[PDB]
Design a protein around this ligand. Structure first.
Ligand SMILES: *C(=O)[C@@H](NC(=O)Cc1cccs1)[C@@H]1N=C(C(=O)O)CCS1
Ligand SMILES: [Mg+2]
Ligand SMILES: [Mg+2]
Length: 466
């Protein structure tokens, strides 16, 4: 058994896919508390998205699994006669789930409260958080994609997965030689557009390219899409999430009989109206719930918003520095020795982050005993599970093995970095394990991971399906 499992893991770690790579692998039994396996457990390594474990085990400590984020609209004073108001501020406070409709339900309320004309400018206020959009060491080349969307307190979230600070761009073919049709999704009318994409012959090489050149708010498209090609869509971030939530809400009011004479812009409530009238409000779901679409798909923008949210709680400052300090200590009050830790962000996107397989495992145990241990274990990706909201980043891994429907682990992928940490619940023992790989030069060593996971699934007393 134990004397056996060792040789197995060792052999799996001898995979050529890991040459030159440093691997942090640690396995412990959450019950007995016995150390089943350990190789370089103390080595500091980049955790990539596995950093989200620390971020989630802290948000639940700081904000409570019942936490809810709210949004609001306000004017100095309510309307009356011709139901006319001056300036209006869209004020949000870190809701990571603001839907387009959520804004439309508020556009309606604004009208349902008598307003019929906004003779003033339409400002968007997101001061609950600082205006520091990206972590200092993130790379600017990664700024056009959903993974690296700017952080703001007031940002619109796309789809059922809540991809924040982004817009869905679409490219539809035409006739060979004619320009292609580009729709900018929500950022239509907001972000600029430079359509250089043509429609290529039917059966031609698709060479489409959707970009947001650094430093601008322009969605650029180049290359060509074949005439016979199927319509393409793609998430893209926008400069200043708030200004877009501002643009959409402006469109939303207009869709609810409220005319806006002034301009739409970035601004905070004057701090001159200590008792402004709150024309409408919105409350999101509880963190316990938002947890799911966070840890299953590793929402990066969610992670950072939580961090800062922790920074507003523990110290009234929507900031990373304050947020991270909160996480560090919250992980300490949770009983986690945070010595080998180095927190530079909440998502794991930063190469300034560092953990040790032991610190990860440590965190796994402690979190299992917290009064929120269930809403936490359930947020984790389940192996081999076909349904996106259950399998998450593990929906296409370990299908048909003892690990199917069993392993609850968190992933982490980055250039030269990959990780898998979680629990393997088996009648033969509750298990917590961490696998961190840094330095390999080829693709993520999934098979190596899966192999160890699936072997643990067995060690825990599971069998592969027939
Ligand atoms: C976590 O690692 C995070 N990864 C990325 O955003 C990839 C980038 C690293 C630098 C710039 S982009 C999320 N987690 C994934 C996982 O498998 O855990 C995959 C992508 S998004
Ligand atoms: Mg528009
Ligand atoms: Mg089973």
């Amino acid at each position: 058994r134990l004397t056996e499992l060792r040789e197995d893991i060792d052999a799996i770690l001898e995979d050529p896919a890991l040459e030159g790579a440093v691997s942090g692998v640690v396995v412990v039994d959450t019950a007995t508390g016995e150390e089943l396996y350990s190789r370089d457990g103390g080595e500091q390594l980049l955790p990539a998205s596995n950093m989200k474990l620390f971020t989630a085990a802290a948000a639940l400590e700081v904000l409570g699994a019942d936490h809810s984020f709210g949004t609001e609209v306000a004017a100095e004073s309510a309307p009356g006669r011709r139901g006319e108001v001056q300036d209006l501020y869209l004020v949000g406070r870190g809701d990571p789930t603001l839907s387009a409709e959520d804004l439309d339900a508020m556009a309606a309320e604004v009208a349902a409260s008598g307003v019929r004309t906004v003779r003033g400018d339409l400002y968007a206020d997101d001061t609950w958080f600082d205006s520091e959009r990206l972590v200092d060491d993130w790379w600017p080349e990664d700024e056009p994609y959903a993974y690296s969307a700017q952080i703001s307190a007031l940002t619109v979230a796309h789809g059922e997965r809540f991809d924040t600070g982004v817009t869905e761009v679409s490219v539809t073919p035409a006739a060979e030689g004619e320009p292609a049709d580009v729709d900018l999704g929500a950022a239509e009318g907001y972000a600029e557009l430079d359509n250089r994409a043509v429609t290529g012959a039917a059966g031609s090489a698709n060479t489409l390219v959707i970009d947001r050149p650094v430093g601008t708010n322009t969605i650029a498209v180049t290359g060509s899409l074949p005439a016979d090609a199927a319509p393409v869509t793609a998430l893209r971030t926008v400069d200043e999430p708030a200004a877009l939530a501002g643009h959409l809400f402006e469109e939303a009011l207009e869709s609810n009989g409220v005319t806006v004479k002034g301009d739409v812009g970035l601004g905070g409530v004057p701090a001159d109206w200590q008792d402004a009238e709150v024309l409408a409000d919105h409350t999101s779901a509880e963190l316990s719930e938002i947890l799911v679409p966070f840890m299953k798909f590793s929402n990066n923008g969610h992670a950072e918003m939580l961090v800062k949210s922790i920074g507003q709680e523990t110290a009234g400052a929507g900031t990373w520095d304050a947020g991270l300090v909160g996480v560090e200590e919250a992980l300490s009050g949770l009983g986690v020795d945070t010595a080998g830790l180095v927190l530079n962000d909440g998502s794991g996107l930063s190469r300034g982050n560092l953990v040790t397989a032991d610190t990860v495992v440590d965190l796994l145990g402690q979190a299992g005993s917290a009064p929120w241990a269930q809403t936490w274990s359930a947020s984790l990706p389940v192996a081999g599970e076909s349904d996106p909201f259950v399998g998450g980043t593990l929906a296409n891994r370990m299908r048909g093995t003892a690990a199917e429907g069993v392993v609850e682990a968190k992933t982490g992928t980055m250039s030269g970095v990959s990780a898998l940490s979680g629990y393997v619940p088996g009648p033969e023992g509750e298990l917590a394990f961490s696998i961190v790989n840094n330095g390999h030069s080829g693709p993520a060593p999934l098979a190596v991971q899966d192999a160890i996971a699936v072997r643990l699934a067995e060690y825990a007393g599971h069998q592969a399906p027939e």
